[PDB]
Amino acid sequence: SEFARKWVPFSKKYSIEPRAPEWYFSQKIDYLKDKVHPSFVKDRRAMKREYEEFKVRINGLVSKAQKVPEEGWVMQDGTPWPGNNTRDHPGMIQVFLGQSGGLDTEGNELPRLVYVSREKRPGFQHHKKAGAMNA
Amino acid sequence: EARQPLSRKVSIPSSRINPYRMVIMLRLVILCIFLHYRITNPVPNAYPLWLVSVICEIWFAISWILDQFPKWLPVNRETYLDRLALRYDREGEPSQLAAVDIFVSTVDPLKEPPLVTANTVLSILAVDYPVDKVSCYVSDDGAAMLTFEALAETSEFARKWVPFSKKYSIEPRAPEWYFSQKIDYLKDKVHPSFVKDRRAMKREYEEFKVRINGLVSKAQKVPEEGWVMQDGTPWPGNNTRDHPGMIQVFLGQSGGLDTEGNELPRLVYVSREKRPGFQHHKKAGAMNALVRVSAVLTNGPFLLNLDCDHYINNSKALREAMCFMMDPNLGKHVCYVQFPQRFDGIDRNDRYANRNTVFFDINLRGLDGIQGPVYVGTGCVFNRTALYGYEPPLKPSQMSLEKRFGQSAVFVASTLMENGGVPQSATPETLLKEAIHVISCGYEDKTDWGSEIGWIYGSVTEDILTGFKMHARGWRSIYCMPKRPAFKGSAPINLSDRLNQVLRWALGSVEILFSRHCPIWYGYGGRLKWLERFAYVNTTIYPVTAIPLLIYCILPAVCLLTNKFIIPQISNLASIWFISLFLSIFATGILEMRWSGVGIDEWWRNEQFWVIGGVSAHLFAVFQGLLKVLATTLLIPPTTLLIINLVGVVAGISYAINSGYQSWGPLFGKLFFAFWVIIHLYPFL
Ligand SMILES: OC[C@H]1O[C@@H](O[C@H]2[C@H](O)[C@@H](O)[C@H](O)O[C@@H]2CO)[C@H](O)[C@@H](O)[C@@H]1O
């Protein structure tokens, strides 16, 4: 969401296809085709560098999360992660971007993004993807 | 002391060409013996299948003799750039090199992308030649505003692109092809400040491409009220069919300065006047108008012709041309210098045979040793005197000039300048008016333009006619083959374009055949070499060969269906000649390979491509030419023919099932013949 805060205005303004940064920046197709805006090259270079830094940050997060701590996961706020036990965790819902989630680089709004994890308890069936879709 | 020639004609050493000639003589003798046998020992009586076969064999032998004769004296040419630089381009003194005017032909910005033309102009403006001795003229036949705006933007970008390429000596100097090369760009680089300059130049080129794309997008939609200039005045070329003549100069003496404070080569955009109901002769008329405008403005002694899709790959091409043009002993008798046509991005297998290395490495090399290569359009440097119709010097009148050239006194006076250039005290405001006058639509009336001088008019490809007319006066042409190709272009992507251009070439050839300029009788008693005339007849009457070939291609199928073979009963006295003839053909192919380095792949591709052309496009061109004289589908005959052969093959084996003891022998010979035909017809179909 933090990276989208700056990625979305670029793709919306320059109408790039595809809008997934991994596949857009890894295409051998000439990226200067049907481009009119005079300020496109520098913006594209800055966006590419920002995406590389974002990928580095994601790799760092994955490397940190690779090792499971003995005392359990702890949030950045300091409270323990409620989903410490996958089989016996409650339900959590978090909203990152939306009406009050913040503004992008152009001062507009961003589509609402919600992270949900349904409650899991031992001995209860969950039906996997069908139950996830219903929830 | 300073008498060493600027160039040398190297004869092919007597270790490959002599075996080649001996093998040609042996093949001629064996062809004569085989045909003498074929005339005798007829097929059993009452079989008309043999007369057609021997007639076709006779025609094939005559065609092969006619094609092989102008290949006896191949020569190469080696240039001394250092001697030319020392003799003329001396350091600390003004350059004495002759001025050059480079013409660039374009017609439609929609069909021809403006980026390619911009890259061509950028490569031309960065040539390794003095800026005061280089002029560039771009002829846009469509009178499009997009071309004018693209040329202005191209000049603006060249203002910074030229110093970079000149300083760092990059190759090629076209930014599109230089920046899109996988070759290590840090090779043979010494200057400490090259990396940052290259990065800045790459970014600037990307921004320039973005600007060009924006201009194209703007010009895509035609406004209802018509195009309007940035100044606010309406675009004069609003109607393509009814627009007047316009000439604009972007860079030059007063066009501005580059990033280093020097000058830039002069760039002129010209569009000849177009009016309804008047013929314009397309590229020939455009070239003639360009020649007249350049004579009025700069009057350069030499003119380099180029299309929009061909860029200068080697920056020293002009020096290579001047090595022949400016030689005191040789330059007096030279009409034009021709460079081989090379295309980038060609398929590695080269299905379409777009490379055409046999014509540019064997045919033209052999032609250079007699009188010179034939004119092929792009990438040629012409002398003004030869273009004007003057005869070459022999080796030991106001009304006439007005009638021959035109009613423009300034142009006639310029034609009399032995060293070129424009006379002093000529006001540029009057030079522009004179150039506009000579570019008018109704100028080439009652004159020799397009009939005896300049680009010769007609519905033909026209690049053979002009060179042949120049050669008929005794002029000598030079074939230059630098190690690095001088110019590079783009090959057709689809087979449709290749077939269409082959059909166009064959139609032009058959049109030349039924015309006054046909080499058989035109120029008789002149200063044209007999072997050169033989080669011209060879390259002129070639598509007629299509008519027997088709018949011969029909010969196996009937031979399979009728159950009779073309040759009589097999005999050892005959089989020896057959096998020895086949071996002679293979040996002469091998030797033609070894002395030229063409390769077995390209040689076999050229053979099968000659077959497919004769059966596909040459046949249609001959039919259309005969219809015109008397008064896709191009792929339809040979496919059918191929299918017919295939069908016949199946039928053949059926007869075997019937006849038992007669399954081998004659049927095997028929299958061998059918396999030979279909393997010649293997590509495409
Ligand atoms: O290739 C340019 C040149 O081709 C001429 O036809 C050639 C043909 O290209 C080549 O493959 C064949 O072997 O010989 C013929 C001889 O005409 C064509 O006539 C020219 O207009 C064209 O510029």
Author numbering:
A (entry chain B): 406 to 540
B (entry chain A): 252 to 647, 713 to 947, 975 to 1028
Source paper text:
Cellulose is synthesized by cellulose synthase (CesA), a membrane-integrated processive family-2 glycosyltransferase. The enzyme synthesizes cellulose from UDP-activated glucose (UDP-Glc) and translocates the polymer across the plasma membrane through a channel formed by its own membrane-spanning segment. While bacterial CesAs primarily function as monomeric enzymes, structural analyses of plant CesAs revealed their assembly into triangular-shaped trimeric complexes of three catalytically active subunits. Cryo-EM analyses of all three CesA isoforms reveal the formation of homotrimeric complexes, similar to the secondary cell wall CesAs.
The helix has been modeled for GmCesA1 and GmCesA6, while its density is detectable at a similar position but too discontinuous for modeling in the GmCesA3 map. TM helix 7 was excluded from the GmCesA3 model due to limiting map quality. The NTD has been resolved at lower resolution for PttCesA8, where it forms a helical stalk extending from the catalytic domains into the cytosol. We observe a similar stalk-like extension in some of the trimeric GmCesA3 particles. However, the NTD is only resolved for a small subset of GmCesA3 particles and not resolved at all for the other GmCesAs. This suggests that it can adopt multiple conformations, with the stalk being one of them. Our GmCesA3 structure contrasts with the recently reported dimeric organization of a fragment of A. thaliana’s (At) CesA3 catalytic domain, which self-associates via β-strand augmentation. Our cryo-EM analysis of GmCesA3 and the other isoforms only revealed monomeric and trimeric states, likely because the region involved in dimerization of the AtCesA3 fragment is inaccessible in the full-length GmCesA3 protein. GmCesA3 exhibits an activity optimum at pH 7 with a sharp decline at pH 8 and 9. Quantifying the release of UDP during biosynthesis reactions using a ‘UDP-Glo’ glycosyltransferase assay reveals Michaelis–Menten constants for GmCesA1 and GmCesA3 with respect to UDP-Glc of 0.44 mM and 0.18 mM, respectively.
